[PDB]
Design an enzyme around this catalytic site. Structure first.
Site, PDB file in Angstrom:
ATOM      1  N   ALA A  89       0.826  -1.202   0.000  1.00  0.00           N
ATOM      2  CA  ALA A  89       0.000   0.000   0.000  1.00  0.00           C
ATOM      3  C   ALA A  89       0.862   1.254   0.000  1.00  0.00           C
ATOM      4  O   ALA A  89       0.611   2.195  -0.761  1.00  0.00           O
ATOM      5  CB  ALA A  89      -0.933  -0.008   1.207  1.00  0.00           C
ATOM      6  N   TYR A  99      -6.799   0.844  -7.999  1.00  0.00           N
ATOM      7  CA  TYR A  99      -5.979   1.364  -6.914  1.00  0.00           C
ATOM      8  C   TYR A  99      -5.148   2.559  -7.353  1.00  0.00           C
ATOM      9  O   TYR A  99      -4.776   3.381  -6.509  1.00  0.00           O
ATOM     10  CB  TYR A  99      -5.063   0.269  -6.364  1.00  0.00           C
ATOM     11  CG  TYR A  99      -5.674  -0.638  -5.311  1.00  0.00           C
ATOM     12  CD1 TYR A  99      -6.797  -0.259  -4.585  1.00  0.00           C
ATOM     13  CD2 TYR A  99      -5.109  -1.872  -5.033  1.00  0.00           C
ATOM     14  CE1 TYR A  99      -7.339  -1.087  -3.624  1.00  0.00           C
ATOM     15  CE2 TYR A  99      -5.645  -2.705  -4.074  1.00  0.00           C
ATOM     16  CZ  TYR A  99      -6.759  -2.309  -3.373  1.00  0.00           C
ATOM     17  OH  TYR A  99      -7.296  -3.139  -2.417  1.00  0.00           O
ATOM     18  N   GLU A 129       2.671  21.827  13.656  1.00  0.00           N
ATOM     19  CA  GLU A 129       1.450  22.454  14.147  1.00  0.00           C
ATOM     20  C   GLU A 129       0.282  21.478  14.203  1.00  0.00           C
ATOM     21  O   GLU A 129      -0.554  21.573  15.110  1.00  0.00           O
ATOM     22  CB  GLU A 129       1.092  23.650  13.266  1.00  0.00           C
ATOM     23  CG  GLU A 129       2.217  24.664  13.133  1.00  0.00           C
ATOM     24  CD  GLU A 129       1.814  25.893  12.342  1.00  0.00           C
ATOM     25  OE1 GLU A 129       0.609  26.049  12.051  1.00  0.00           O
ATOM     26  OE2 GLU A 129       2.704  26.705  12.012  1.00  0.00           O
ATOM     27  N   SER A 135      -0.089   0.208   4.999  1.00  0.00           N
ATOM     28  CA  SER A 135      -1.413  -0.381   5.118  1.00  0.00           C
ATOM     29  C   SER A 135      -1.689  -0.814   6.551  1.00  0.00           C
ATOM     30  O   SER A 135      -0.785  -1.206   7.294  1.00  0.00           O
ATOM     31  CB  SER A 135      -1.553  -1.587   4.189  1.00  0.00           C
ATOM     32  OG  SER A 135      -2.563  -2.467   4.648  1.00  0.00           O
TER      33      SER A 135
HETATM   34  N1  LIG Z   1      -5.179   2.985  -1.208  1.00  0.00           N
HETATM   35  C1  LIG Z   1      -4.526   1.867  -1.500  1.00  0.00           C
HETATM   36  N2  LIG Z   1      -4.615   0.782  -0.657  1.00  0.00           N
HETATM   37  C2  LIG Z   1      -3.951  -0.360  -0.940  1.00  0.00           C
HETATM   38  C3  LIG Z   1      -3.167  -0.437  -2.080  1.00  0.00           C
HETATM   39  N3  LIG Z   1      -2.629  -1.674  -2.112  1.00  0.00           N
HETATM   40  C4  LIG Z   1      -3.044  -2.364  -1.028  1.00  0.00           C
HETATM   41  N4  LIG Z   1      -3.876  -1.571  -0.295  1.00  0.00           N
HETATM   42  C5  LIG Z   1      -4.527  -1.941   0.978  1.00  0.00           C
HETATM   43  O1  LIG Z   1      -3.756  -2.926   1.644  1.00  0.00           O
HETATM   44  C6  LIG Z   1      -4.545  -3.986   2.141  1.00  0.00           C
HETATM   45  C7  LIG Z   1      -3.893  -5.329   1.802  1.00  0.00           C
HETATM   46  O2  LIG Z   1      -2.661  -5.528   2.476  1.00  0.00           O
HETATM   47  P1  LIG Z   1      -1.243  -5.081   1.844  1.00  0.00           P
HETATM   48  O3  LIG Z   1      -1.094  -3.583   1.847  1.00  0.00           O
HETATM   49  O4  LIG Z   1      -1.090  -5.636   0.449  1.00  0.00           O
HETATM   50  O5  LIG Z   1      -0.126  -5.749   2.786  1.00  0.00           O
HETATM   51  P2  LIG Z   1       1.414  -5.713   2.334  1.00  0.00           P
HETATM   52  O6  LIG Z   1       1.904  -4.288   2.314  1.00  0.00           O
HETATM   53  O7  LIG Z   1       1.571  -6.380   0.988  1.00  0.00           O
HETATM   54  O8  LIG Z   1       2.187  -6.574   3.442  1.00  0.00           O
HETATM   55  P3  LIG Z   1       2.236  -8.167   3.266  1.00  0.00           P
HETATM   56  O9  LIG Z   1       0.863  -8.763   3.454  1.00  0.00           O
HETATM   57  O10 LIG Z   1       3.195  -8.744   4.268  1.00  0.00           O
HETATM   58  O11 LIG Z   1       2.719  -8.438   1.868  1.00  0.00           O
HETATM   59  C8  LIG Z   1      -5.919  -3.832   1.512  1.00  0.00           C
HETATM   60  O12 LIG Z   1      -6.887  -3.764   2.530  1.00  0.00           O
HETATM   61  C9  LIG Z   1      -5.909  -2.521   0.754  1.00  0.00           C
HETATM   62  O13 LIG Z   1      -6.888  -1.651   1.276  1.00  0.00           O
HETATM   63  C10 LIG Z   1      -3.066   0.659  -2.938  1.00  0.00           C
HETATM   64  O14 LIG Z   1      -2.378   0.614  -3.956  1.00  0.00           O
HETATM   65  N5  LIG Z   1      -3.751   1.809  -2.633  1.00  0.00           N
HETATM   66  N1  LIG Z   2      -2.645  41.249   9.408  1.00  0.00           N
HETATM   67  C1  LIG Z   2      -2.050  40.049   9.242  1.00  0.00           C
HETATM   68  N2  LIG Z   2      -2.257  39.094  10.179  1.00  0.00           N
HETATM   69  C2  LIG Z   2      -1.680  37.878  10.063  1.00  0.00           C
HETATM   70  C3  LIG Z   2      -0.826  37.612   8.902  1.00  0.00           C
HETATM   71  N3  LIG Z   2      -0.387  36.350   9.022  1.00  0.00           N
HETATM   72  C4  LIG Z   2      -0.910  35.848  10.166  1.00  0.00           C
HETATM   73  N4  LIG Z   2      -1.683  36.757  10.778  1.00  0.00           N
HETATM   74  C5  LIG Z   2      -2.395  36.542  12.055  1.00  0.00           C
HETATM   75  O1  LIG Z   2      -1.517  35.839  12.931  1.00  0.00           O
HETATM   76  C6  LIG Z   2      -2.162  34.724  13.536  1.00  0.00           C
HETATM   77  C7  LIG Z   2      -1.283  33.501  13.332  1.00  0.00           C
HETATM   78  O2  LIG Z   2      -0.152  33.545  14.193  1.00  0.00           O
HETATM   79  P1  LIG Z   2       1.337  33.389  13.609  1.00  0.00           P
HETATM   80  O3  LIG Z   2       2.070  34.708  13.653  1.00  0.00           O
HETATM   81  O4  LIG Z   2       1.336  32.832  12.209  1.00  0.00           O
HETATM   82  O5  LIG Z   2       2.008  32.344  14.620  1.00  0.00           O
HETATM   83  P2  LIG Z   2       3.604  32.231  14.705  1.00  0.00           P
HETATM   84  O6  LIG Z   2       4.204  33.077  13.611  1.00  0.00           O
HETATM   85  O7  LIG Z   2       4.013  30.786  14.559  1.00  0.00           O
HETATM   86  O8  LIG Z   2       4.050  32.738  16.052  1.00  0.00           O
HETATM   87  C8  LIG Z   2      -3.473  34.529  12.813  1.00  0.00           C
HETATM   88  O9  LIG Z   2      -4.548  34.533  13.749  1.00  0.00           O
HETATM   89  C9  LIG Z   2      -3.621  35.683  11.846  1.00  0.00           C
HETATM   90  O10 LIG Z   2      -4.797  36.432  12.156  1.00  0.00           O
HETATM   91  C10 LIG Z   2      -0.652  38.706   7.924  1.00  0.00           C
HETATM   92  O11 LIG Z   2       0.059  38.552   6.912  1.00  0.00           O
HETATM   93  N5  LIG Z   2      -1.271  39.862   8.165  1.00  0.00           N
END
Ligand SMILES: Nc1nc2c(ncn2[C@@H]2O[C@H](COP(=O)(O)OP(=O)(O)OP(=O)(O)O)[C@@H](O)[C@H]2O)c(=O)[nH]1
Ligand SMILES: Nc1nc2c(ncn2[C@@H]2O[C@H](COP(=O)(O)OP(=O)(O)O)[C@@H](O)[C@H]2O)c(=O)[nH]1
Ligand SMILES: Nc1nc2c(ncn2[C@@H]2O[C@H](COP(=O)(O)OP(=O)(O)OP(=O)(O)O)[C@@H](O)[C@H]2O)c(=O)[nH]1
Ligand SMILES: Nc1nc2c(ncn2[C@@H]2O[C@H](COP(=O)(O)OP(=O)(O)O)[C@@H](O)[C@H]2O)c(=O)[nH]1
Ligand SMILES: [Mg+2]
Ligand SMILES: [Mg+2]
Lengths: 432, 430, 430, 432
Positions: free
Chosen positions: A12, A217, A247, A133
């Site tokens: 998967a 798939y 975050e 998976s």
């Molecule tokens: N979204 C998505 N799910 C997948 C895909 N291939 C397998 N799965 C999921 O994986 C499950 C089957 O088990 P596998 O992922 O094949 O197990 P494995 O990774 O081969 O591990 P082994 O059994 O030891 O070979 C199914 O329930 C699928 O939902 C894929 O290509 N896309």
């Molecule tokens: N006026 C203004 N407000 C901003 C901007 N970017 C983020 N904010 C405000 O800042 C808050 C986000 O906090 P932030 O500064 O991104 O967190 P930190 O930088 O990780 O400390 C949000 O609630 C926004 O309202 C901007 O470009 N202009």
């Protein structure tokens, strides 16, 4: 300056990863190799070399060698570094013990080494992305084995994971309850946030919204790829209100043992029917909270939201986002938990989603990806636990697991741990 | 003389600060490269307030841009007027704060705060007569609330007598953009109330309304709001940079606007603000500019003053005006809305008139108001803080970074006292 | 008059010395062939300090290049400004020292030291008024530590009154490049402390930081560091070669910088040092040049002065400057950092102003500091020396060359006393 | 001005020497003869004649004549002076006594004469390079016989030797323990520094890093040749921080009886997989200390380092070297002995390594060769001593050695001497 190490385990993860790096390559102008034609923000995911070759910062690992061999012969044959593609001798045969105890013990050290070489090649480590998976085999034993190793070697660094959670009705393996519960027990204390997706849910979306009666798939993987592109878009591209992978942890995880948000991607629309839709910000925002569009077949209105993250892309005006969220807060059917007056984390980016050639999604202008933590997912564990109890009472398949390094005690411990987690959701879901 | 040193923080600070310097350069005739090409000579006389000089006429802003991630700063320098700053002033870390006050204050910003001071002290030491520090940040984030308050505490312990004025973006009541805002805001206010002389509360919801109602703008970017915040920041520091009939230094406002030490939170306003199509339906004279300044809908804070009383008010006018009209109009407001002004302050209005208006405008006026109605903002945060903290909503992200649960209780109690203090002074004498 | 005779040693000396003569020739307008093509006439007036004259205007440096292997010297002559030297001055052996002090001091350099003196005496005897000898070497090597100290002892026994100033590259604390550095360094210092009037300690780790932090250089070759070392070497000998408002002879610095006979180890510094992109964001005036000279990050020695006190300080300015600013700025430093200056020396700063700046620069200043913080360097070497010597780590390579274990004990004891002496004078009066 | 006399004894030395002088000839523009086409630093290794012919400063000696005869008929037939190639009548038959006592007594005088003629033709003598096998025969008896003669005639001149130390598991001769120990006993007091290499280790590198499943002895020799080129690069080419052959002695030998450093060469990378590697200074430096890349199959982390020499080549910035070494000093797994605070000797050269045509290594930009002295090698002697004790208790093959000039007493003396050496390592490895 930022970085992300993508680890893809099991079939998967590898198949999902192929869709991801096909999309990442498109978003940066890469040419299916490390080459770029005659494009500057790739540093987060793609390493650079003097030859002009970009080496993906990913590790493809599988105890089976069939799927990885296809990559080495595919169009992306020349993209990955050969030592990243790690292949074992024999698969885990859908057995958690083989992936965790017997086979995994001979490959976990090799993959960890390549991570180490990548880890110390980063200007600053931001976290990991784990694709695997939930069904079982390598995706359950090896992933749990690998996650616990990372929790020690890298400690407090973020570890995000995207998981193919088992579907309610659709099932592909007979022993999923054993493997699905076992991985959860050994990954609760080693994972920061786990994003859930079900094939049945995406199948429903692919036929209910995309007018395709033959989902493969590959179709589901591309839908999942778009979700990951939105989650990591903030790092890759500029925007008005950026959100970082550290975050999500404090925004979506209120308690250490409850870190399983659902997933949603609103503008999933066919090319033909996009001509008849305005696709404004308010409507796509409201589409996220509908049961019909959840990527996990769990109805949110059965429970209460406790944290939501909205990640907008493209031509998005923040004023509409402010208006759009407030009205959703007004609806009495969209119920949020009492102890979280502040429900929403908002991120806006200027890069519209890129449509892969040959894809099904339309050439959308603006898109939103919602990461919602809800008590409704407690029902999914209850259904999974119910299936596990039926089999274990009869010892339906225990001898396979007991005879390959595991012990009868672990089954009881894993189920009991899940029971507490189900109880933990109930306490969170009740106020006063 | 009276030099001001500009300090940034978080994503919000750099974005607002970047637009702050674009406007300041525009009114001083400074090119994005740093050269001077202005017309009037007055704009060059007091340029030392914000700019430092170098060879060839290049003027270097006295700004310090800092954040725990390089992404926002990389955008600042790449964008217009980004090459103007001195590179050494960009003090940035690698691992950003996850919107948790603890990380930016105790763990992550702790190892970076020392470097920022090394740049501030070098900047501060180069001033002939240091007036104070101007800071722009956001209380809802991690870097802003955590590191910004960390920087404030260090400076107030190192320059006790200088004035520290902060332009803080306060969380809006309608909708949030960070789940843990109540924790970050309450912890930040616990610091500001002790280590800043005046704070200007602004919330994005208020500035959206100003654009929607007044400017009639349909696609308001964050750049649009930053321009409004830049204008109020520019207005309050016009006396230091231009001549006028009646000047108002930054310390002059604080004395007239801060009765008691802990009540130093204002809600600013700006005028005139007209849409492109409504410009021809206004007289654009002193009487109407004063009319909308006290209007509840023309204020950059969510709190409506009608719910409380004005302890004090400041009106900084720009452009050539009849001082009589300014005195008459200000008195008129004091009369009609006598119920809106506290009664143990005989006069609540402070008037200042700068001679030169902003570019493209004949007249301008910046409103500053200290009202007991601002207790509504803090009580709303207190209500949300206690709801989450009552059952440990997100503490483990904070306690795991080094904080303790006792600190949250102290912050809430200190926040509650400030709300009580505002309410106590809203009752008339005896 | 006041001629200086340049002496090299080891690979380090020839590399640094080669860059030393490239810079000196550049500021005197001397072509690599030896001809003069300068513009100003002052640079030719005092050219006898470093150069000797011949027919046709050829100027021959008064340099002696010596090492126990021909490879490095062969590189020197082949490279630019290599043909300038007189061939007779290249005194070289065949079997190099294996980085062991004993071989270069007792066995290998013993049979070559006599030839070097035959060239030094011929050079020294040709000076109208001999000022002293300038030596460049490295204490961590074999030829430098062994033969360099051997040459110093011979000269100090033959020219007792002349001044012997040595620019020695000291081992860095972070990482080494020779396993037996503690043995070589301790044995060399046991000699320098008795037979040199002033030593300038520089370590490559410090000069890497100066390039990384200040010059923002990403590919620092050893040539880049040598240029910095050349600049400080050039600065200290500007008074002898150019006019100035207030001159400082080499013997003038030693009196003002050496309180007691054994405390003659300084840590130099240079200013200004700016990257190509940061040149336009500096005023490049006297106040800022003095600001970074006392900054701990702008010093070419690992030791940080904040850990100790300045016994004395020298500031040699170049270029036309306001003498008032020099006096004012120097006094300002004495005031703020009064805790950083010893208290039984009322004045710790010696000021000198040369009129002509280095090529391409309007202003320059060379810092020299005698600090008790340098005891940190010697104690670190003593700690490493005793660890190895406690169990005969590598002695047989030294005892087999002629040394005795008693010599190691004497060197360690003498090294320990010097550390103690520095510590004794770091305590205030009584 | 500098010089080195290369003496190659036994089949291992001659075949290894052929790779060396093929590489030296390439590095200086020589044309497989003494001719140079229509290039100035060859004086260290190659003598010059008025005809334009350069005569290698080497001596090829073997009691067997098969291998040397191949040289006389090979492409380098016209390169060596005929009297340098010295051939005996019959081989030592993998017997130490024959090489040391019976056969060697009839050829040692002849080779010593040619060395004497070369010795007095040098402007200044710098040392010797000795290439020989540790397995036995000529490489053990003759080499020990020759080394003791040199210790008298040339005394304090340096004598470096590169030895093919026996592998732990892989073995080609049944009586290696007898010959391997016997040569060590008679060479400890006559050798300054001995560099060890094992075929198994280089086999592992050749298949683990070079993508070749068919390593021949030619492949290993070329890998060994690159190591020697780096060691002697400082003399041959200019650089920022040169290191001489007399420096290795005091830098790597803390005690007279402990002079057996290991060997490592970091950028051993295939041409195809080099496109996916940045090959920066920090990463290649860290590769040296991994167990997977040691040229001797002895894991360093089993013991403590006591001295290391790093020899960088090509476009190398010394600042990175300073940074790269310091971080290695920080790691707690890379343990250095207590009494050596100063662990590293650094040398930098501007000549990038030259890739032999038809070779396997890539066209690297910068390379590093590490010469590390570690107490871990004490385990190798213990394993070798254990094998020796088993055979000697039964007198498995003693009669061959006793009947060809040796005596029963020497076996006991050699083993007892080795026992002290193993004990000597223990004392060095313990502090306080
Ligand atoms: N979204 C998505 N799910 C997948 C895909 N291939 C397998 N799965 C999921 O994986 C499950 C089957 O088990 P596998 O992922 O094949 O197990 P494995 O990774 O081969 O591990 P082994 O059994 O030891 O070979 C199914 O329930 C699928 O939902 C894929 O290509 N896309
Ligand atoms: N006026 C203004 N407000 C901003 C901007 N970017 C983020 N904010 C405000 O800042 C808050 C986000 O906090 P932030 O500064 O991104 O967190 P930190 O930088 O990780 O400390 C949000 O609630 C926004 O309202 C901007 O470009 N202009
Ligand atoms: N690296 C390398 N090792 C070799 C080579 N040839 C032989 N050896 C080693 O030498 C050992 C075998 O002994 P020899 O070197 O052949 O002994 P000899 O030199 O022929 O001496 P005699 O036995 O008397 O003929 C084996 O363990 C090999 O590891 C070679 O070409 N390259
Ligand atoms: N600045 C500078 N330092 C050098 C240079 N070469 C060597 N060194 C220093 O000198 C020390 C090596 O000693 P070295 O002079 O080579 O030993 P010796 O010549 O055999 O006596 C090293 O620690 C280097 O830091 C150079 O070209 N420039
Ligand atoms: Mg499989
Ligand atoms: Mg043979």
């Amino acid at each position: 300056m930022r970085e992300c190490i993508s680890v893809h385990i099991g079939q998967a993860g590898v198949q999902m990863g192929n869709a991801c790096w096909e999309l990442y390559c498109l978003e940066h102008g890469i040419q299916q190799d490390g080459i770029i034609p005659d494009d500057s923000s790739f540093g987060t995911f793609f390493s650079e070399t003097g030859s002009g070759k970009h080496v993906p910062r990913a590790v493809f690992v599988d105890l089976e060698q069939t799927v990885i061999g296809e990559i080495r012969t595919g169009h992306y044959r020349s993209l990955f570094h050969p030592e990243q593609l790690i292949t074992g001798k024999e698969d885990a045969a859908n057995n958690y013990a083989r992936g965790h105890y017997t086979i995994g013990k001979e490959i976990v050290d090799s993959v960890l080494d390549r991570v180490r070489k990548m880890a110390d090649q980063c200007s600053g480590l931001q976290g990991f992305l784990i694709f695997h998976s939930f069904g079982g085999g390598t995706g359950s034993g090896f992933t749990s084995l690998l996650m616990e190793r990372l929790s020690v070697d890298y400690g407090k660094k973020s570890k995000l994971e995207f998981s193919v959670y088992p579907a309610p009705q659709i099932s592909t393996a007979v022993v999923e309850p054993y493997n699905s519960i076992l991985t959860t027990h050994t990954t609760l204390e080693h994972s920061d946030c786990a994003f859930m997706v079900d094939n049945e849910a995406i199948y429903d979306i692919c036929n209910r919204n995309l007018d395709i009666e033959r989902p493969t798939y590959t179709n589901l993987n591309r839908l999942i790829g778009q979700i990951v592109s939105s989650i990591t878009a903030s790092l890759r591209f500029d925007g008005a209100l950026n959100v970082d992978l550290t975050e999500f942890q404090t925004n979506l995880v209120p308690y250490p043992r409850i870190h399983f948000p659902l997933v949603t991607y609103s503008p999933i629309i066919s090319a033909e029917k996009a001509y008849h839709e305005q696709l404004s910000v308010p409507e796509i925002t409201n589409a996220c909270f509908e049961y019909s569009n959840q990527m996990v077949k769990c109805d949110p209105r059965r429970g209460k939201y406790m944290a939501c993250c909205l990640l907008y892309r493209g031509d998005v005006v923040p004023k509409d986002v402010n208006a759009a969220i407030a009205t959703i807060k007004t609806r009495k059917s969209i119920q949020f938990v009492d102890w979280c007056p502040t429900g929403f984390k908002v991120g806006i980016n200027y890069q519209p989603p890129t449509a892969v050639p040959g894809g099904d999604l339309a050439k959308v202008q603006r898109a939103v990806c919602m990461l919602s933590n809800t008590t409704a997912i407690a029902e999914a564990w209850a259904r999974l636990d119910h299936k596990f109890d039926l089999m274990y009472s009869k010892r339906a398949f225990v001898h396979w697991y007991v005879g390959e390094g595991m012990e009868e005690g672990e089954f009881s411990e894993a189920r009991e741990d899940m029971a507490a987690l189900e109880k933990d959701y109930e306490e969170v879901g009740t106020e006063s | 003389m009276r030099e001001i040193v500009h300090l940034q923080a978080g994503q919000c600070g750099n974005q607002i600060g970047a637009k702050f310097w674009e406007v300041i350069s525009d009114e001083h005739g400074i090119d994005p490269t740093g050269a001077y090409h202005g017309d009037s000579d007055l704009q060059l006389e007091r340029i030392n307030v914000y700019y430092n000089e170098a060879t060839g006429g290049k003027y270097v802003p006295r700004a310090v841009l800092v954040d725990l991630e390089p992404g926002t700063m990389d955008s600042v320098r790449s964008g217009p007027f980004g090459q103007i700053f001195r590179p050494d002033n960009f003090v940035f870390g690698q691992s950003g704060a996850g919107n948790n006050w603890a990380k930016g204050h105790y763990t992550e910003g702790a190892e970076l705060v020392d470097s920022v001071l090394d740049v501030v002290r070098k900047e501060a030491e180069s001033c002939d007569c240091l007036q104070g520090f101007q800071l722009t940040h956001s209380l809802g984030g991690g870097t802003g609330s955590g590191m910004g308050t960390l920087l404030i505490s260090k400076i107030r312990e190192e320059y006790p007598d200088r004035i520290m004025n902060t332009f803080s973006v306060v969380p809006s009541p309608k909708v949030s953009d960070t789940v843990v805002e109540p924790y970050n805001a309450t912890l930040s206010v616990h610091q500001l109330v002790e280590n800043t002389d005046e704070t200007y509360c602004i919330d994005n919801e208020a500035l959206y309304d100003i654009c929607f109602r007044t400017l009639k703008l349909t696609t308001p970017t964050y750049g649009d709001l930053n321009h409004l915040v830049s204008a109020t920041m520019s207005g309050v520091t016009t006396c230091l940079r231009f001549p006028g009939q009646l000047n108002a230094d930054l310390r002059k406002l604080a004395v007239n606007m801060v009765p008691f030490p802990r009540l130093h939170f204002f809600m600013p306003g700006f005028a005139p603000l007209t849409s492109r199509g409504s410009q021809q339906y206004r007289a654009l004279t002193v009487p109407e500019l004063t009319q909308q300044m006290f209007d509840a809908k023309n204020m950059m804070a969510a709190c409506d003053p009608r719910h409380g009383r004005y302890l004090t008010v400041a009106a900084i006018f720009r452009g050539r005006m009849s001082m009589k009209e300014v005195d008459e109009q200000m008195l008129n407001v004091q009369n009609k809305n006598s119920s809106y002004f506290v009664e143990w302050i005989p006069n609540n209005v402070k008037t200042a008139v700068c001679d030169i208006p902003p570019r493209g405008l004949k007249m301008s006026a910046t409103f500053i108001g200290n009202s007991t109605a601002i207790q509504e903002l803090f009580k709303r945060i207190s209500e949300q803080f206690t709801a989450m903290f009552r059952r440990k909503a997100f503490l483990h992200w904070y306690t795991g970074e080094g904080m303790d649960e006792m600190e949250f209780t102290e912050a809430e109690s200190n926040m509650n006292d400030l709300v009580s203090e505002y309410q106590q002074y809203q009752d008339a004498t005896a």
